[PDB]
Design an enzyme around this catalytic site. Structure first.
Site, PDB file in Angstrom:
ATOM      1  N   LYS A  98       0.853  -1.170   0.000  1.00 45.43           N
ATOM      2  CA  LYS A  98       0.000   0.000   0.000  1.00 45.43           C
ATOM      3  C   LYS A  98       0.877   1.202   0.000  1.00 45.43           C
ATOM      4  CE  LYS A  98      -4.046  -1.714   2.345  1.00 45.43           C
ATOM      5  NZ  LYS A  98      -5.331  -1.393   3.024  1.00 45.43           N
ATOM      6  N   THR A 128     -10.356   8.071  -0.401  1.00 49.57           N
ATOM      7  CA  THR A 128     -10.119   7.663   0.961  1.00 49.57           C
ATOM      8  C   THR A 128      -9.357   6.339   1.025  1.00 49.57           C
ATOM      9  OG1 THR A 128     -12.458   8.409   1.249  1.00 49.57           O
ATOM     10  CG2 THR A 128     -11.161   7.855   3.183  1.00 49.57           C
ATOM     11  N   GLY A 129      -8.728   6.070   2.163  1.00 52.10           N
ATOM     12  CA  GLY A 129      -8.404   4.684   2.520  1.00 52.10           C
ATOM     13  C   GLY A 129      -6.955   4.456   2.945  1.00 52.10           C
ATOM     14  N   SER A 130      -6.644   3.236   3.354  1.00 50.80           N
ATOM     15  CA  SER A 130      -5.249   2.931   3.766  1.00 50.80           C
ATOM     16  C   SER A 130      -4.157   3.253   2.701  1.00 50.80           C
ATOM     17  CB  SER A 130      -5.125   1.533   4.346  1.00 50.80           C
ATOM     18  OG  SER A 130      -5.797   1.505   5.624  1.00 50.80           O
ATOM     19  N   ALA A 139      -9.528   1.254  -4.881  1.00 53.70           N
ATOM     20  CA  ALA A 139     -10.800   0.682  -5.418  1.00 53.70           C
ATOM     21  C   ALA A 139     -11.163  -0.478  -4.541  1.00 53.70           C
ATOM     22  CB  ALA A 139     -10.581   0.197  -6.839  1.00 53.70           C
ATOM     23  N   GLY A 145     -16.782   2.256  -3.384  1.00 52.40           N
ATOM     24  CA  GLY A 145     -17.768   2.797  -2.492  1.00 52.40           C
ATOM     25  C   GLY A 145     -18.307   1.791  -1.489  1.00 52.40           C
ATOM     26  N   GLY A 201     -16.758   0.709   1.383  1.00 48.90           N
ATOM     27  CA  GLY A 201     -16.511   1.315   2.695  1.00 48.90           C
ATOM     28  C   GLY A 201     -16.122   2.798   2.654  1.00 48.90           C
ATOM     29  N   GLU A 218     -17.140  10.280  -3.861  1.00 54.40           N
ATOM     30  CA  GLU A 218     -16.153   9.694  -4.749  1.00 54.40           C
ATOM     31  C   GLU A 218     -16.494   9.692  -6.259  1.00 54.40           C
ATOM     32  OE1 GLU A 218     -14.594   6.099  -3.284  1.00 54.40           O
ATOM     33  OE2 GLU A 218     -13.499   7.331  -1.795  1.00 54.40           O
TER      34      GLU A 218
HETATM   35  O1  LIG Z   1     -10.013  -5.334  10.766  1.00 56.67           O
HETATM   36  P1  LIG Z   1      -9.833  -4.670   9.294  1.00 56.67           P
HETATM   37  O2  LIG Z   1     -11.110  -4.965   8.369  1.00 56.67           O
HETATM   38  O3  LIG Z   1      -8.623  -5.294   8.731  1.00 56.67           O
HETATM   39  O4  LIG Z   1      -9.790  -3.081   9.466  1.00 56.67           O
HETATM   40  C1  LIG Z   1      -8.569  -2.367   9.224  1.00 56.67           C
HETATM   41  C2  LIG Z   1      -8.581  -1.866   7.794  1.00 56.67           C
HETATM   42  O5  LIG Z   1      -9.712  -1.317   7.232  1.00 56.67           O
HETATM   43  C3  LIG Z   1      -9.420  -0.966   5.929  1.00 56.67           C
HETATM   44  O6  LIG Z   1     -10.332  -0.373   5.065  1.00 56.67           O
HETATM   45  C4  LIG Z   1      -8.097  -1.320   5.674  1.00 56.67           C
HETATM   46  O7  LIG Z   1      -7.395  -1.146   4.518  1.00 56.67           O
HETATM   47  C5  LIG Z   1      -7.585  -1.877   6.835  1.00 56.67           C
HETATM   48  O8  LIG Z   1      -6.323  -2.343   7.013  1.00 56.67           O
END
Ligand SMILES: O=P(O)(O)OCC1OC(O)C(O)C1O
Ligand SMILES: O=P(O)(O)OCC1OC(O)C(O)C1O
Lengths: 217, 217
Positions: free
Chosen positions: A6, A27-29, A82, A94, A96, A102
């Site tokens: 990532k 958004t996101g990790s 994505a 979309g 989470g 978005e």
């Molecule tokens: O317990 P989970 O589902 O792994 O929650 C942590 C995370 O939620 C996410 O959207 C991630 O990319 C991630 O590492």
């Protein structure tokens, strides 16, 4: 996959960032790693537009001016992950995050950099469920029409979007013709947004693999 | 054309409802008169679905059980009028009423019964402004896309729908392929609904003449 994967791909999206512009940020990790990259560029851009509550807060952790969509005639780029992505660079997004937010920022941007780990690419779309945002009064009716398309819609109970809409997550479609699927669902009264990102897909796909970022363009 | 033409018209639809069933009700000068008809045979009607606050409350003071769309699979009929309707029985709707609930109640209903005065028949739709309901963060976006399509969209400033969205009323259009433009419009991200009932049109068309109403089944 892993967060070191990532990381890479997020960092690789900073190449595409034009000196002195407003940056589209999803958004996101994987996205959070890109934001770190941009923090190395807070003075050499104009601002940033975000489709995320958390992303807006981090951009304001590095001192980046946020704009809203009604403030710019365009974005150069919009960087986001994505949920699933095909060889055709069409996405299911979309699952989470704010679907509607978005798709709007994405349609407004010039380039769409998708930054992902090893686990987002699929053969056919649909095992990861397709989110469909709906007018609450239309849920049942839209649910019926999705069963009509070969899905198994599941009411995401307990929640609503900011819009105040509900979400149907649709399981068990084999989504062979995604441009056409997004037309059908798009065609349904009640439907606010479908998470098929097929008509406007990724322009660049930047994957992070055990041996660095690999970019497709 | 006249308030007696409306009333001959909305009363003439009365012949379309049956016993122990659930009726679709719109809104408008001309449905009022039909609501005025519906009361007399209220005892044989399971009760009603409507797409409008005013109708709901008028049907309620009549002792007509209201239902929601989430309670039903279908409705035998929807009576409402239009802003415009063409020879192909396609309509511009929701300049005046709740666009989203009309389009939704019309989708659950088997038979749509357009009740109308002399002013509604056009050949080419588009003179009367075309409503498009739009998530606010998208308003200028969707509006740039509307221009491309030969449109002059005009934000209906000072108001919003029950859910918090804005209205864009589009002028200057020559709408000869409605299903196409609907397709196209349902397809901009940030669009919620479009005032084109083209895929799903009026089944029966009830106008107002000088004596009785022309009807066309
Ligand atoms: O317990 P989970 O589902 O792994 O929650 C942590 C995370 O939620 C996410 O959207 C991630 O990319 C991630 O590492
Ligand atoms: O002439 P306009 O500006 O379309 O407004 C009048 C009416 O339009 C409608 O749909 C009606 O039911 C109605 O009374």
């Amino acid at each position: 996959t892993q967060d070191e994967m990532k990381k890479a791909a997020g960092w690789a999206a900073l190449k595409y960032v034009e000196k002195g512009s407003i940056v589209g940020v999803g958004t996101g990790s994987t996205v959070n790693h890109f934001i770190d990259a941009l923090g190395t560029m807070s003075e050499e851009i104009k601002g940033a537009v975000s489709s995320s509550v958390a992303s807006t807060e981090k951009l304001e952790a590095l001192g980046i001016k946020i704009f809203d969509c009604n403030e710019v005639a365009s974005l150069d780029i919009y960087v986001d992950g994505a949920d699933e992505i095909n060889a055709d660079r069409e996405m299911i997004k979309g699952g989470g995050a704010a679907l509607t937010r978005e798709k709007i920022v994405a349609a407004i941007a010039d380039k769409f950099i998708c930054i992902v780990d090893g686990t987002k690419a699929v053969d056919v779309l649909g095992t990861f469920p397709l989110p469909v945002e709906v007018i609450p009064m239309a849920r049942s009716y839209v649910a019926r029409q999705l069963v009509k398309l070969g899905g198994d819609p599941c009411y995401r109970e307990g929640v609503i979007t900011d819009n105040g809409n509900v979400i149907l997550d649709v399981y068990g479609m084999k989504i062979t013709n995604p441009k056409q699927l997004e037309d059908q669902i798009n065609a349904i009264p009640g439907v606010v947004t479908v998470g098929l990102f097929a008509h406007r897909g990724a322009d660049v796909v930047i994957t992070g693999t055990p041996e660095g970022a690999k970019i497709e363009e």
